[PDB]
Amino acid sequence: DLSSRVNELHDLLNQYSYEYYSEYDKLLHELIKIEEEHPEYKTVDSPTVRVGGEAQASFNKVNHDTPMLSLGNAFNEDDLRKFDQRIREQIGNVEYMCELKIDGLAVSLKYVDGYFVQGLTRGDGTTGEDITENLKTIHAIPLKMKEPLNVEVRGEAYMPRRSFLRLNEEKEKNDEQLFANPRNAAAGSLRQLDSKLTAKRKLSVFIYSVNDFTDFNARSQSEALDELDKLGFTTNKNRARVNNIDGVLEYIEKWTSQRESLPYDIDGIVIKVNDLDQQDEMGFTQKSPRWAIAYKF
């Protein structure tokens, strides 16, 4: 009874993915062998893609459906008070969403009818490289979302510091060039031409936004991040909605001292106007949003 067993195997495998991230091993090998004798039982979201595959990703250059955002920077309290004053003068009272800027490989993941179908590096923000097969090996990326949306979700892929060090340990022993940091270890593992090598590296992802909110019920950035969780994605819960710029400054103070302490590196904090109508209202200047800014440590 292959139908029941394939459905069973998908449930068991996808649950491993939603969990942690070698019953697993044997289960995966059983589904692979089913798909070899019955290629018609391979669905677009089959979990056998987690192992990597024979197809080498292209690294073809592809434009994102929508260019990713290009953020201005802030370097001090004065930069942030000016940011918030520009906002308050233009459109009045706002709340802010504050989040940690993960030091990893930025990617955009394209979903069509809720299936994961293309993953690109952020590249220059307009054009990225296609590493779809490599990204499918990350358990924390859902192969099918919980609603059948057509959206590009934007994330950062990273390697935990502990696994980066174990990888450098193996380079140290082979006296190869070491990765300078966990960021380069993620980017390097995701840009392998053999996605089977990628599969064997320890990678995860945090999702931080989407290209288009049309089909979301969310009215604010904090609410959209909760909606992304509900749809199946992994988001970073160190984010916080705050009421004002004093709240931003207090979030920055707290995280500044803690920037070495998490399992992954971070390179600053991103602050956005929370309400989505208010983002639209604030607009862009010189091709960068007037309602978002990246604070650099």
Tab-separated table of C-alpha atoms in Angstrom:
chain	number	residue	atom	x	y	z
A	1	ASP	CA	0.000	0.000	0.000
A	2	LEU	CA	2.337	2.749	-1.264
A	3	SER	CA	-0.101	5.587	-0.961
A	4	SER	CA	-0.579	5.127	2.707
A	5	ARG	CA	3.137	4.485	3.280
A	6	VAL	CA	4.277	7.525	1.256
A	7	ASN	CA	1.797	9.691	3.143
A	8	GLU	CA	3.050	8.098	6.371
A	9	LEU	CA	6.748	8.611	5.418
A	10	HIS	CA	6.067	12.276	4.477
A	11	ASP	CA	4.426	12.857	7.832
A	12	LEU	CA	7.215	11.196	9.775
A	13	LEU	CA	9.998	13.014	7.773
A	14	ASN	CA	8.420	16.464	7.796
A	15	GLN	CA	7.912	16.145	11.495
A	16	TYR	CA	11.643	15.529	11.900
A	17	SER	CA	12.179	18.771	9.975
A	18	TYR	CA	9.681	20.857	12.026
A	19	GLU	CA	11.313	19.420	15.196
A	20	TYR	CA	15.053	19.752	15.795
A	21	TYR	CA	16.344	22.039	13.143
A	22	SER	CA	18.605	7.835	12.551
A	23	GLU	CA	15.285	6.135	12.389
A	24	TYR	CA	15.401	9.261	10.195
A	25	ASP	CA	18.096	7.778	7.976
A	26	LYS	CA	16.202	4.510	7.364
A	27	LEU	CA	12.891	6.315	6.787
A	28	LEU	CA	14.536	8.687	4.281
A	29	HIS	CA	16.171	5.799	2.497
A	30	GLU	CA	12.892	3.942	2.280
A	31	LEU	CA	11.121	6.923	0.616
A	32	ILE	CA	14.037	7.432	-1.769
A	33	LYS	CA	13.779	3.865	-2.888
A	34	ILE	CA	10.021	4.138	-3.308
A	35	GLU	CA	10.553	7.247	-5.529
A	36	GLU	CA	13.128	5.350	-7.625
A	37	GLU	CA	10.755	2.470	-8.385
A	38	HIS	CA	7.749	4.825	-8.563
A	39	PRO	CA	8.860	8.265	-9.760
A	40	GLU	CA	5.195	9.314	-9.995
A	41	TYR	CA	4.929	9.191	-6.168
A	42	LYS	CA	7.491	12.037	-5.884
A	43	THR	CA	5.537	15.204	-5.122
A	44	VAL	CA	6.988	18.716	-5.505
A	45	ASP	CA	7.319	18.843	-1.696
A	46	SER	CA	8.841	15.365	-1.241
A	47	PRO	CA	11.148	15.335	1.767
A	48	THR	CA	13.717	13.242	-0.126
A	49	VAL	CA	15.119	16.602	-1.365
A	50	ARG	CA	16.516	17.243	2.131
A	51	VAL	CA	19.353	14.865	1.334
A	52	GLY	CA	20.481	16.952	-1.545
A	53	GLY	CA	20.375	15.568	-5.014
A	54	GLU	CA	21.981	14.699	-8.326
A	55	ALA	CA	20.944	18.050	-9.867
A	56	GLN	CA	23.676	20.668	-9.265
A	57	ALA	CA	22.094	24.101	-8.516
A	58	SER	CA	22.643	26.447	-11.479
A	59	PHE	CA	23.974	29.628	-9.884
A	60	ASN	CA	22.076	31.131	-12.746
A	61	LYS	CA	21.505	34.828	-12.128
A	62	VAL	CA	17.763	35.581	-11.578
A	63	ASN	CA	16.036	38.789	-10.670
A	64	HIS	CA	13.924	38.682	-7.529
A	65	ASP	CA	10.165	39.196	-8.282
A	66	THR	CA	10.606	42.337	-6.163
A	67	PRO	CA	14.123	43.846	-5.404
A	68	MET	CA	15.107	43.380	-1.792
A	69	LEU	CA	15.267	46.389	0.416
A	70	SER	CA	18.382	48.519	0.668
A	71	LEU	CA	18.556	49.945	4.136
A	72	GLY	CA	20.129	53.201	5.348
A	73	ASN	CA	22.483	52.910	8.365
A	74	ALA	CA	22.506	54.436	11.826
A	75	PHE	CA	25.648	54.525	13.938
A	76	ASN	CA	24.556	56.311	17.076
A	77	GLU	CA	21.718	57.635	19.197
A	78	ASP	CA	21.663	60.857	17.226
A	79	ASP	CA	21.211	58.993	13.901
A	80	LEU	CA	18.234	57.196	15.419
A	81	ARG	CA	16.606	60.306	16.881
A	82	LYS	CA	16.788	61.988	13.465
A	83	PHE	CA	15.296	58.857	11.818
A	84	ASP	CA	12.413	58.941	14.283
A	85	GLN	CA	11.932	62.708	14.053
A	86	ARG	CA	11.659	62.525	10.208
A	87	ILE	CA	8.970	59.853	10.699
A	88	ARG	CA	7.072	61.662	13.426
A	89	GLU	CA	7.056	64.955	11.514
A	90	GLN	CA	5.812	63.307	8.305
A	91	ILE	CA	3.090	60.960	9.613
A	92	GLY	CA	2.877	61.376	13.420
A	93	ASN	CA	2.894	58.647	16.098
A	94	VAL	CA	4.269	55.215	15.120
A	95	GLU	CA	5.337	52.093	16.975
A	96	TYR	CA	8.588	50.307	15.979
A	97	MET	CA	9.489	46.745	15.372
A	98	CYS	CA	13.083	46.028	16.512
A	99	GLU	CA	14.949	42.900	15.390
A	100	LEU	CA	18.402	41.425	15.402
A	101	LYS	CA	20.219	41.593	12.054
A	102	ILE	CA	21.560	38.070	11.618
A	103	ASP	CA	25.135	37.764	10.177
A	104	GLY	CA	24.465	35.102	7.548
A	105	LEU	CA	23.665	34.588	3.851
A	106	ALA	CA	20.563	36.684	2.955
A	107	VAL	CA	18.251	34.722	0.622
A	108	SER	CA	14.715	35.059	-0.844
A	109	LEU	CA	12.524	32.015	-1.034
A	110	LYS	CA	9.815	31.964	-3.682
A	111	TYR	CA	6.558	30.045	-2.931
A	112	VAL	CA	3.966	29.349	-5.643
A	113	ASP	CA	0.657	27.977	-4.418
A	114	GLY	CA	2.406	27.442	-1.131
A	115	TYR	CA	5.183	25.221	-2.600
A	116	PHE	CA	8.827	26.170	-2.283
A	117	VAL	CA	10.049	26.492	-5.876
A	118	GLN	CA	13.050	28.837	-6.078
A	119	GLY	CA	15.655	30.053	-3.583
A	120	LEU	CA	18.093	32.835	-4.560
A	121	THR	CA	20.906	34.592	-2.726
A	122	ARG	CA	20.099	38.223	-2.116
A	123	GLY	CA	22.987	39.072	-4.491
A	124	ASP	CA	23.043	42.848	-5.217
A	125	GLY	CA	19.410	43.156	-4.058
A	126	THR	CA	17.982	43.006	-7.659
A	127	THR	CA	19.721	39.904	-9.035
A	128	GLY	CA	20.741	36.843	-7.031
A	129	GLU	CA	22.131	33.435	-7.781
A	130	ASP	CA	19.903	30.335	-7.840
A	131	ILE	CA	20.927	27.848	-5.106
A	132	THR	CA	17.470	26.289	-4.819
A	133	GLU	CA	18.651	22.658	-4.472
A	134	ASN	CA	21.091	23.686	-1.703
A	135	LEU	CA	18.467	25.619	0.291
A	136	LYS	CA	16.051	22.669	0.128
A	137	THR	CA	18.497	20.815	2.361
A	138	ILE	CA	17.722	23.210	5.266
A	139	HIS	CA	15.091	21.576	7.501
A	140	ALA	CA	13.974	24.917	8.821
A	141	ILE	CA	12.788	25.915	5.339
A	142	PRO	CA	9.303	24.450	4.840
A	143	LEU	CA	8.835	22.797	1.454
A	144	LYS	CA	5.127	23.550	1.571
A	145	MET	CA	3.531	26.387	3.562
A	146	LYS	CA	0.295	25.961	5.565
A	147	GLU	CA	-1.666	28.189	3.170
A	148	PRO	CA	-1.211	28.116	-0.646
A	149	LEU	CA	0.263	31.623	-0.990
A	150	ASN	CA	2.342	33.092	-3.875
A	151	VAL	CA	5.041	35.163	-2.145
A	152	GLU	CA	8.836	35.592	-1.818
A	153	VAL	CA	9.931	35.363	1.807
A	154	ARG	CA	13.214	36.926	2.845
A	155	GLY	CA	15.553	35.282	5.289
A	156	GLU	CA	19.104	34.858	6.463
A	157	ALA	CA	20.645	31.425	6.359
A	158	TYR	CA	23.301	30.888	9.082
A	159	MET	CA	25.508	28.229	10.669
A	160	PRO	CA	25.552	28.064	14.485
A	161	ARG	CA	28.933	29.173	15.886
A	162	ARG	CA	29.507	25.753	17.460
A	163	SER	CA	29.262	23.949	14.088
A	164	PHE	CA	31.383	26.593	12.347
A	165	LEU	CA	34.162	25.827	14.893
A	166	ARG	CA	33.876	22.071	14.327
A	167	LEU	CA	34.197	22.707	10.558
A	168	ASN	CA	37.264	24.914	11.065
A	169	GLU	CA	38.668	22.130	13.328
A	170	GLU	CA	38.610	19.816	10.248
A	171	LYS	CA	40.237	22.525	8.104
A	172	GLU	CA	42.803	23.206	10.871
A	173	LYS	CA	43.718	19.496	10.718
A	174	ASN	CA	44.017	19.603	6.885
A	175	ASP	CA	45.811	22.950	7.131
A	176	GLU	CA	43.268	24.396	4.611
A	177	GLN	CA	42.073	27.962	4.628
A	178	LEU	CA	39.798	28.413	7.602
A	179	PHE	CA	36.451	30.226	7.324
A	180	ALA	CA	36.973	33.663	8.756
A	181	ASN	CA	33.581	33.485	10.552
A	182	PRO	CA	30.235	31.682	10.763
A	183	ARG	CA	28.774	33.910	8.025
A	184	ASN	CA	31.432	32.729	5.512
A	185	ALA	CA	30.891	29.100	6.643
A	186	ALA	CA	27.116	29.389	5.833
A	187	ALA	CA	27.708	31.115	2.475
A	188	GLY	CA	30.358	28.609	1.630
A	189	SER	CA	28.209	25.590	2.515
A	190	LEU	CA	25.220	26.958	0.593
A	191	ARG	CA	27.295	27.694	-2.577
A	192	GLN	CA	28.474	24.120	-3.021
A	193	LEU	CA	27.738	22.732	-6.512
A	194	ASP	CA	26.898	19.382	-4.858
A	195	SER	CA	23.811	19.865	-2.663
A	196	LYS	CA	24.707	16.506	-1.001
A	197	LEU	CA	27.657	18.353	0.622
A	198	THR	CA	25.385	21.138	1.690
A	199	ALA	CA	23.024	18.572	3.270
A	200	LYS	CA	25.806	17.388	5.507
A	201	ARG	CA	26.501	20.914	6.982
A	202	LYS	CA	24.551	22.303	9.937
A	203	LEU	CA	22.416	25.188	8.662
A	204	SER	CA	19.249	26.963	9.675
A	205	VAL	CA	17.372	30.094	8.714
A	206	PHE	CA	15.466	32.996	10.227
A	207	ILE	CA	12.755	34.578	8.101
A	208	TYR	CA	12.347	38.329	8.591
A	209	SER	CA	9.926	39.597	5.907
A	210	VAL	CA	8.004	39.039	2.628
A	211	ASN	CA	8.004	40.866	-0.702
A	212	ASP	CA	4.156	41.358	-0.793
A	213	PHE	CA	1.559	41.477	2.042
A	214	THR	CA	-1.438	41.318	-0.269
A	215	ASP	CA	-2.530	37.849	0.984
A	216	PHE	CA	-1.567	38.231	4.663
A	217	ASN	CA	-4.144	39.224	7.295
A	218	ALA	CA	-1.346	41.116	9.094
A	219	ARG	CA	-1.614	44.866	9.614
A	220	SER	CA	1.798	45.400	11.136
A	221	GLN	CA	5.377	44.055	10.819
A	222	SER	CA	5.114	42.296	14.284
A	223	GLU	CA	1.839	40.725	13.288
A	224	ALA	CA	3.265	39.597	9.919
A	225	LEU	CA	6.108	37.897	11.701
A	226	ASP	CA	3.594	35.956	13.846
A	227	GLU	CA	1.723	35.050	10.600
A	228	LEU	CA	4.981	33.732	9.077
A	229	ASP	CA	5.395	31.487	12.163
A	230	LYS	CA	1.836	30.142	11.706
A	231	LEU	CA	2.504	29.482	7.959
A	232	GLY	CA	5.385	27.211	8.849
A	233	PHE	CA	8.493	29.412	8.895
A	234	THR	CA	11.255	29.845	11.512
A	235	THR	CA	11.485	33.411	12.809
A	236	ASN	CA	13.713	34.933	15.511
A	237	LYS	CA	11.861	35.705	18.683
A	238	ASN	CA	14.395	38.195	19.970
A	239	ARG	CA	12.308	40.693	17.953
A	240	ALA	CA	10.225	43.191	19.974
A	241	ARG	CA	7.546	45.760	19.213
A	242	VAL	CA	8.236	48.966	21.109
A	243	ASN	CA	6.196	52.142	21.526
A	244	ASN	CA	8.726	54.815	20.687
A	245	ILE	CA	12.326	55.783	20.106
A	246	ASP	CA	13.129	55.523	23.842
A	247	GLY	CA	11.983	51.933	23.521
A	248	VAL	CA	14.288	51.443	20.495
A	249	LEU	CA	17.251	52.862	22.390
A	250	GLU	CA	16.569	50.618	25.328
A	251	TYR	CA	16.350	47.555	23.043
A	252	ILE	CA	19.691	48.499	21.448
A	253	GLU	CA	21.351	48.930	24.851
A	254	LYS	CA	20.250	45.492	25.935
A	255	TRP	CA	21.309	43.724	22.769
A	256	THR	CA	24.624	45.563	22.246
A	257	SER	CA	26.217	43.941	25.312
A	258	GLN	CA	24.687	40.602	24.311
A	259	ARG	CA	25.847	40.512	20.694
A	260	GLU	CA	28.421	37.694	21.276
A	261	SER	CA	26.188	35.606	23.390
A	262	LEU	CA	23.764	33.897	20.936
A	263	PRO	CA	24.296	30.748	19.074
A	264	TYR	CA	24.722	32.764	15.786
A	265	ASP	CA	26.540	36.099	15.068
A	266	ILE	CA	24.575	39.388	14.492
A	267	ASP	CA	25.828	42.623	12.899
A	268	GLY	CA	23.311	45.093	14.162
A	269	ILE	CA	19.615	45.741	14.801
A	270	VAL	CA	16.979	46.600	12.136
A	271	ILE	CA	14.231	49.047	13.227
A	272	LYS	CA	11.008	49.430	11.133
A	273	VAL	CA	7.845	51.445	11.471
A	274	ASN	CA	5.447	48.698	12.650
A	275	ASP	CA	2.092	49.505	10.979
A	276	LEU	CA	2.177	48.501	7.302
A	277	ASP	CA	-0.015	51.375	6.071
A	278	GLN	CA	2.403	53.727	7.792
A	279	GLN	CA	5.396	52.119	5.990
A	280	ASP	CA	3.544	52.778	2.686
A	281	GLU	CA	2.811	56.250	3.801
A	282	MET	CA	6.468	57.056	4.592
A	283	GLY	CA	7.718	56.014	1.168
A	284	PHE	CA	11.290	55.741	-0.235
A	285	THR	CA	14.097	58.216	-0.860
A	286	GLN	CA	17.110	57.411	-3.127
A	287	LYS	CA	15.757	53.913	-3.470
A	288	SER	CA	15.852	53.161	0.279
A	289	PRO	CA	12.824	53.080	2.710
A	290	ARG	CA	12.333	56.117	4.921
A	291	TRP	CA	10.566	53.890	7.467
A	292	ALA	CA	13.370	51.339	8.127
A	293	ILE	CA	17.014	51.634	9.197
A	294	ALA	CA	19.829	49.307	10.155
A	295	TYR	CA	21.718	50.245	13.380
A	296	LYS	CA	25.339	49.031	13.116
A	297	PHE	CA	27.217	48.031	16.293
